Design a protein around this ligand. Sequence first.
Ligand SMILES: Cn1cnc(Cn2c(=O)nc(Nc3cc4cn(C)nc4cc3Cl)n(Cc3cc(F)c(F)cc3F)c2=O)n1
Ligand SMILES: Cn1cnc(Cn2c(=O)nc(Nc3cc4cn(C)nc4cc3Cl)n(Cc3cc(F)c(F)cc3F)c2=O)n1
Lengths: 299, 299
Amino acid sequence: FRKMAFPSGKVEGCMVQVTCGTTTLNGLWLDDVVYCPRHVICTSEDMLNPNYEDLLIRKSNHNFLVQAGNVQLRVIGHSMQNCVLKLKVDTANPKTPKYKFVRIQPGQTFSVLACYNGSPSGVYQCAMRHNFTIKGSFLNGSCGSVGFNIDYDCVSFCYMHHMELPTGVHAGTDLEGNFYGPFVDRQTAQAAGTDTTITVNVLAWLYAAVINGDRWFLNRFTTTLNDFNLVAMKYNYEPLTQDHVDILGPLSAQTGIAVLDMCASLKELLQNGMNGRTILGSALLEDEFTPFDVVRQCS
Amino acid sequence: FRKMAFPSGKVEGCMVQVTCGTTTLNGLWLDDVVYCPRHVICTSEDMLNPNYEDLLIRKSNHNFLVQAGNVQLRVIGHSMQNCVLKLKVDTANPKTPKYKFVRIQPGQTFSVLACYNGSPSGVYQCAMRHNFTIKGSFLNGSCGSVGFNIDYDCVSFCYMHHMELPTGVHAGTDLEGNFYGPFVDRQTAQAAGTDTTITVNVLAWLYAAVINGDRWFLNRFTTTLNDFNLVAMKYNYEPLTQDHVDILGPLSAQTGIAVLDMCASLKELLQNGMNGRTILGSALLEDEFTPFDVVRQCS
Ligand SMILES: Cn1cnc(Cn2c(=O)nc(Nc3cc4cn(C)nc4cc3Cl)n(Cc3cc(F)c(F)cc3F)c2=O)n1
Ligand SMILES: Cn1cnc(Cn2c(=O)nc(Nc3cc4cn(C)nc4cc3Cl)n(Cc3cc(F)c(F)cc3F)c2=O)n1
């Protein structure tokens, strides 16, 4: 098992650079609109405690430099939606894919196209942690890089990168400009909430093991969901939601192992450990493969 | 710090489907030639023990169906170069990138674009191992997927996927059709040579751990190159050369940790184990990052 990103071509053709004075970052060009973090309108002095409403009134269309490669896209309108800037440009992107804007739940994975100065650099899979941060790999100049999933040629954009936290994890918004988690777009020290293990994904990893014939940890017990959630919290595992139980449906049907029976097996592993035994050739439980990721790799 | 692949868009526009009878796999369309594994000309009976020159002489151009998306390309010529079939087509691929064909050395990494029926499915980083296998993520229908590196807009193709060995590792050729390793393109069980660990890559990754703030494995011991290499060989690690030491120069400069001091750290890890601790979230010693991979992602 390894982390597999979606092919990035449909997103590469949408990346542009957006510059305001000397502040520069990445934006996303879809039809005739460029979406980017509103942080671009900040001078160095504004980044600590920006007054975004005040900073925008000073700005006119001709203050925004938008470039696809070295080709300038003239801005003909600008607005602010939550923490994203929307720049209307005079050219509709001929490479615009079929796309949606989605807001993802914690545990869900997505592909990140890391970009610098509008130029795509690399692609990798990330998971949204339950404290609404991601353990990404980002350098300076990456602000505005996006995260996405692809279903049947349709790109669902779910993340726009804004900042690095002191602990080295990363925080950002959806493509409507709403932050994931309790963060704000200022250059101030903000702490990630305490992280938890992503229970739904650990359960998917256990189903993956079963599919590949590694099933020693299957015990003879069952549990209720309420009983399991209360126990899981004592081991810094996330409580399961009703949506979590349902996205485990396909793996449960494939293996014939009821979701609640697998929760009982996981509860046993938490209360007693693994005793030098491995699962999928590993002594650590993996929590960054979703049920969908598992089916992608197994079938 | 993460395993990061190159953006795949320049390769996506070159993937097509090749079909001969009921046998089908992926091909690479560059200018007016489609490159694909010659295994495509085998029926299920042929696959077990194929005489390829005999099989190819009995084929005509119209025995080859090539589809790019929904568009059918007409084959107007064919030839075989080692294990690679070259189909001349009546249309040049307008999305052909600047490209080269290169044969890589063990320890070097590349990006894989996994494809099924000519449609790209995922992208991830792999390394050529010392026994000329790769630990990929490939399912049925992935034959003909390619591996590549991207250097300022030029795609250097280095791998064409052929088969999965009974241990689950993968084997393939360069784009001139020569296998990496002692394998042949026939459906028979094939084992690889002993899998020696890429020592210079493990050292690069330990330097990545330091650069990313993890230092528990460092120590005050010292070692000579030969004394380290004695322990390395004992543990089936590749001997470290002065060229490897030189290549690690920039990382030792950045961290102030001498290369032979990092060797002392690795020697203890090999002799004592990790004591349940982890490095960069991994419970085992990672050997699929090159010094350049670490430099590029950390800077
Ligand atoms: C190491 N790292 C990992 N992720 C990041 C993301 N990131 C970023 O790329 N840039 C940021 N500040 C800027 C500085 C600029 C200097 N010039 C010339 N232009 C610049 C543009 C930007 Cl955006 N930041 C900091 C940051 C960005 C925000 F959007 C925000 F709301 C708060 C912040 F503190 C940053 O985190 N760097
Ligand atoms: C599980 N896995 C991981 N990697 C692979 C790659 N792979 C593959 O995709 N296909 C193969 N055999 C074929 C069967 C076909 C059935 N039809 C209808 N069409 C087919 C086309 C192919 Cl290529 N193989 C096996 C294989 C492929 C070779 F190129 C070879 F030289 C020897 C082999 F044993 C395969 O490994 N599968």
